[PDB]
Design a binder for this molecule. Sequence first.
Ligand SMILES: [Zn+2]
Ligand SMILES: [Zn+2]
Lengths: 886, 886
Amino acid sequence: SLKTDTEMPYPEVIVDVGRVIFGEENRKKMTNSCLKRSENSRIIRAICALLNSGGGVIKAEIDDKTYSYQCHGLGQDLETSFQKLLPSGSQKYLDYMQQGHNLLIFVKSWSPDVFSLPLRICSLRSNLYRRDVTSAINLSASSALELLREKGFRAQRGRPRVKKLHPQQVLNRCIQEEEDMRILASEFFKKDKLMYKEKLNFTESTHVAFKRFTTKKVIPRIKEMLPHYVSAFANTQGGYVLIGVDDKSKEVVGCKWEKVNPDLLKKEIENCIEKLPTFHFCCEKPKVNFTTKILNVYQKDVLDGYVCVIQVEPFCCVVFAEAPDSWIMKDNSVTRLTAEQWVVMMLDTQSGYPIKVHKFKEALQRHLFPVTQEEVQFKPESLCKKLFSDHKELEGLMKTLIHPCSQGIVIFSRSWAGDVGFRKEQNVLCDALLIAVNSPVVLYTILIDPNWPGGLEYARNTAHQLKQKLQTVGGYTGKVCIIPRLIHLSSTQSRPGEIPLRYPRSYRLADEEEMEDLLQALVVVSLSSRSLLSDQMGCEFFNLLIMEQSQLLSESLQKTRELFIYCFPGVRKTALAIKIMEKIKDLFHCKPKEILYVCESDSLKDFVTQQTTCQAVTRKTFMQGEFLKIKHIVMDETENFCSKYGNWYMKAKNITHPKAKGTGSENLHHGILWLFLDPFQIHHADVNGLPPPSAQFPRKTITSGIHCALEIAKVMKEEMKRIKENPPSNMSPDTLALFSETAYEEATSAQALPGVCETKTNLTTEQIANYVARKCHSLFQSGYLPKDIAILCRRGEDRGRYRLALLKAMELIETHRPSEVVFSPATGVWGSHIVLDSIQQFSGLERTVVFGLSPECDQSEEFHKLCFASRAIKHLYLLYEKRAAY
Amino acid sequence: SLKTDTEMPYPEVIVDVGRVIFGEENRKKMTNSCLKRSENSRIIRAICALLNSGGGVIKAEIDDKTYSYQCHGLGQDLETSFQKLLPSGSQKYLDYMQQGHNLLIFVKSWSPDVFSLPLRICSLRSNLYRRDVTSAINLSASSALELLREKGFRAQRGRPRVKKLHPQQVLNRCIQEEEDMRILASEFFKKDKLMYKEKLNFTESTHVAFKRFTTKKVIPRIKEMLPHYVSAFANTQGGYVLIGVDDKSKEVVGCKWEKVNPDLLKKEIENCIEKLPTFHFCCEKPKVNFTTKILNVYQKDVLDGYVCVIQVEPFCCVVFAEAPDSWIMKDNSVTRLTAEQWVVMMLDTQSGYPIKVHKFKEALQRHLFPVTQEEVQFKPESLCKKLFSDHKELEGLMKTLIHPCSQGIVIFSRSWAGDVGFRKEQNVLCDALLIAVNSPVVLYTILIDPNWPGGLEYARNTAHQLKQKLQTVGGYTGKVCIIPRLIHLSSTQSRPGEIPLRYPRSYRLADEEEMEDLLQALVVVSLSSRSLLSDQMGCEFFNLLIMEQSQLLSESLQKTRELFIYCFPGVRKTALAIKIMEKIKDLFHCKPKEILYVCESDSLKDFVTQQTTCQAVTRKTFMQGEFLKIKHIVMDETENFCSKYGNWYMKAKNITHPKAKGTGSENLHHGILWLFLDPFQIHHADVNGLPPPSAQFPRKTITSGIHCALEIAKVMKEEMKRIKENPPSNMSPDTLALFSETAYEEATSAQALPGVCETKTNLTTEQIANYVARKCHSLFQSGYLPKDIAILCRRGEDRGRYRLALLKAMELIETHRPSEVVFSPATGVWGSHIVLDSIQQFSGLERTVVFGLSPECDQSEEFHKLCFASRAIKHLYLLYEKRAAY
RNA sequence: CAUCAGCUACCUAAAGUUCAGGUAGCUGAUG
Ligand SMILES: [Zn+2]
Ligand SMILES: [Zn+2]
């Protein structure tokens, strides 16, 4: 929930930085430089925190009543800070607007695209130092990322032993190089005493730094200056810090013995180095390997001072001089990141990522949300019809609000808050999302009772969560503003608030490409969640997946003639078979009636002839007819076939691959004979008529066809594992050896979409009917159609009682509209009514929502759940009756 | 080549920058700022040119004879320039060394790795400007690359209808934002006259720049300052440049009428803008669109001055303020890149590039050049044996040269210059490349004659080209020095080097990991060359490819039982078959003797039975013998089988797929029956005995087995296409329609390695024999073994005459060593002799070098070239005969 | 909180394109 803010209530995280001087002239004439730096730091830290936490607004109070942003500007130091924070351009992330006595900085979230640097977060200073010749350089964010990746790569592989000290070698004199400085510094370090004003024969280098003591508080100044050099040396190659050496004259100076105590100085140096932040990519976690030594300075055997030399060894990993200058938002406060958190965020590579959704979002957007100059479109279709029939005035009111927009899309929802995974409000009738070119995105929240006090907060929160989901889940990397607007139906004429929310001009959708990008992000967001729009776009998404998978499978039409295709539960092989026949006709240039489809059930037969131009018959018709004109045969639900009516396999083999007795004919034809098999649903195991599993070659196992919900897929996976644990004696274990849970789980994570699957038990008939009627009413309120719901009973003798109870419950809930409730059998797929039939009659058919009603069958039958889940795409509701024992 | 350099003859590109002052105090005290800036610019341009051209050395003469790098360092301004040029650290690229009166800067080539930004070249300044609030920012190299990619991506996707009007913008009453300043600037631009010192109601912004006219030369100052603002505006969003407006006081100042001519000022502004460099990603290539306006200022109806306002519209792709501040080395000179060349190198994505070679380079290095502490090893073994037998003291002299190097690898070559694709020198006996830990890489060049004056130049050029190849082709991104040394065999009075070559200590192989990386780079370089070492590495590389491809193919053992495998020419199906038998034994857990391999030729059967533990017989033996214990059958060269001895296909099918009779046992066994087919190598094409092509299912086409030279694969591709143009009349062309030329070309590029394929025509027996003898002698000098060479005749009757001619030729040419040259038949492939037989007897067998001796068989047969190429791995020499008398 | 030495912009005198300076910015040292 966003923090309450009644004046300028933006649907963003708002950071109040207090009273700030603004304007180029006003900033320049500031006399208190400390206050100037304080104001600059507050604003820049807030910007960095907002850049790292999804964007937001910075609100600053303007002290000058005569200040005008048009005539005065921002300020040179503020702009310099912005350019330091955003070297790629602050225009892409910052916008400025003056609202009366406030100045607002609109911060867009830091989200790089593919064609840019792979920086995950923003930093002022990384505070990782690297030694470049004779300078300790505070690395930029990109430089720090390079260093982190190099250290991680080096430490991923181990370095045991490391006996590469190699005693010592011979030095060289005729040639001077940087290694000579390190050798000379090491010779200096092994000394124990120095003569006063002793000349040093070496200068600073990559491994040598020269420092001098101060004529003021000495230990605190060393504590400020040391971390930079220690970090720089440890990070690059190691080196020496020579405190007490004059840079220019190269003479030993040292600190006077009265002004410092060498033991205390040693302890302070050790303390400051020990507390330096560190990150390790290795497991041993070595500490910073350093050794400090005090060298007494003597003037004619008289103690005069000390020279402190610190040896810093190369570090295996990164060393921080302090915590990085990077900020995030935590509990509505700008919080500094620690070194450990900063490295973790900087090296993140997560940006659970759906490959297929982002691959097909463009096609889904071009199909479902086309950006055209063809008047404003109201989506989704079914929900809009229900809302407009429920309220006559709603449609005209929306057109009045939308005007004067000519091109755009308005996407309705029963609850947009619930659509994005947050709380549904009962007092909210619906939410409409207007998306148009050269317009801000507007979220209209229609209320039932205008006197409800939570409308403003609900709309603001919903707009905020939608934008956050679009940026994070949807991957939207643009400037978009969602304006929450509270609307009621009580007055046909509705007018906005006296303080309309305003955003910079850059926060509108500039063109059609930006509108298309936002709509593609919305496709991703909706597919990631649970709603009616998710279910409908999920059906379209599954169609695209079926098309690509069917293309891959048809590539085997030129490699095989006879093929046994083993399919896991829930792969949707009927759709695969339909597209395969399409490819057969295309490739073999045959007549559509030359391809034959053989299935076991008649409802599936009716469905297939309705969806294909090829000849489809049941196995009974296949055995009772003549098919001399058939060249190719595709078989489905072959596991339910029977040998009682003859050898269907021999007949199919003879048709597709006819042998010649006595040859004579030179036009022998070999045809396609593909059998789609599902070993996991082989029930009532009599003589199947199939050849033995040893002779079922060549074979193909289909693993990546699961087109159901994640919850439904997990139920089927659990059932498959349990079945494999205790396989029935009537099915061959060798066919079950081809199914692996790991491959099945990988396919589920690749394809399946979030859905609904719940179970309720110990319910009487009236309770089960009541649950189904209430849930169906709830689904119809959200925009679901009756053709999306199927109620399936385990046994066919329960149909009559269940139908009677369902009519009673549904008419009881429909006390306003006395319309007769129509149920249709499994053959009514083209119908727009709720399908009510048995699980065996619905074989090969699937619906978005399935209610499964069964008696108590604990350990009596272990197949019923698998069959129920195979007919459901998004919603599965398992209901179990009460065991009537008396 | 390399420019001659008597002093400091480094095998690098040396840039001489003349006399330069060095040292911190010397640079700081320098009074002539022009001379100081000039020296800094010269050095920094040389460094950038070397970073972009494979590295090199910079030589600067030191004017101060008392200067010492140990005690004076380099200088403040020089180090600052390095930090701008190399923001990621100059420690990884720059090394310094004083050598007498010269200071040397060693520049390592700029080569980004996986853990770095994808910057291809180094630049001081992109000179691409971007408007950040009220500043025109000269973008860095990384920022410029990001901007270039953004514009390239935007021009990749079409922006149609060019609706850049952006409706109309009006000023809001109470909201002030950055768009308001642009609107106010447009209103000011539309004005025609001004008032003297009249105030402005807007300030600078992203679209507004205020500039003042100068009280000096006006046109030069305008022409100097304008390109930055024009580039910045055209690159960000467009804007207005208001010349004549005071930024501090915000009134119109203007320039006096007597000081400039407005027509002249407009013309110079036009000329300046159209002279700006510009790069385009689009196709229209529009020019930079700008509009200049002169606003007269009138003070009481008196013409006082003029104000120039320039309006710039958002450019399509890119505008440069001037040529990019980046350099390369072109014709031994530091040359500034132009805008077009700079964008090309910046956007270059070339890193042909062998994917498989870089994948297998690590395994190849660990197998052929192991890095352990096992004393210095000599490679390659065959060439080393030849060299040490011909020169008795060579091994001892080499051993004393390496001393005291304990661990390392010496890689000999008859010509290392030839190995890297350059000119071989007959005056050079051999080159030995020493690679060792804690040591520089040394290239020893042994000369037969001490008095040859070209020895030093040859050694230096070879070292330079080898390092360049290692960096470019090999992908080596470390600091490595290849020190060229001249070595003399006969002269025992070994004169030491007058001027030893010195490199910074960072140019040694620091540890074992760097040694392995350098060796992997050398493996990549060798695999991209034509040499003996490349041929041996290619053999091992092809073995790894066979392992990978056989594993992929064995994945089908669980899916098929009978499989018709079609193999392209040059697929090496015998090696695939051998590994498949291993997998059959592994998977079905059967005895090795229960797997039967069937081929046609006796030589292939012999080769297979030494290569595998499974049973292997020919087709005649298979038909005659009894194999009731055989469970799986793999058949090779099935296209050559003969059906006059019976039905081998039916016999194989009954063994692998027996038919049950009398029922009783339900444990029928189904065995593997894999047939390897080569449709293009069917000679004497009678009834094969295979089933008709309509019944050869399931099938698999293999194209990813091409394991020969690029040239040999290209020859086979030509012959395959000519086969497809005029198909044979004894079989249906349906089988030959499964071989696509594009797939074969893709496979050849993916796997094949560079080699030799030469054709010679119109030669009598004596010329052919002499040519083969001279070629064999040349190969034997390079380290080729006699087991690498096979001489194959088209006609079996020519074997004796060719044998006599070849024996005479090699006895005539072997005047230095009377080795007994023995020719082995096609049954002695595993022997150490040269194979001399016919093409028919060598079927299924390969050798690295093949000599094909054929008569004038043009327009008589058409399989000869394909068959000869199928037997050659790296070298193919096709020789043709004339009409000789009896 | 001051001061100085180094890195682009802006400005004035000087000179046939040098030059003297001056200003606010960026970051090293001292106080
Ligand atoms: Zn570590
Ligand atoms: Zn363009």
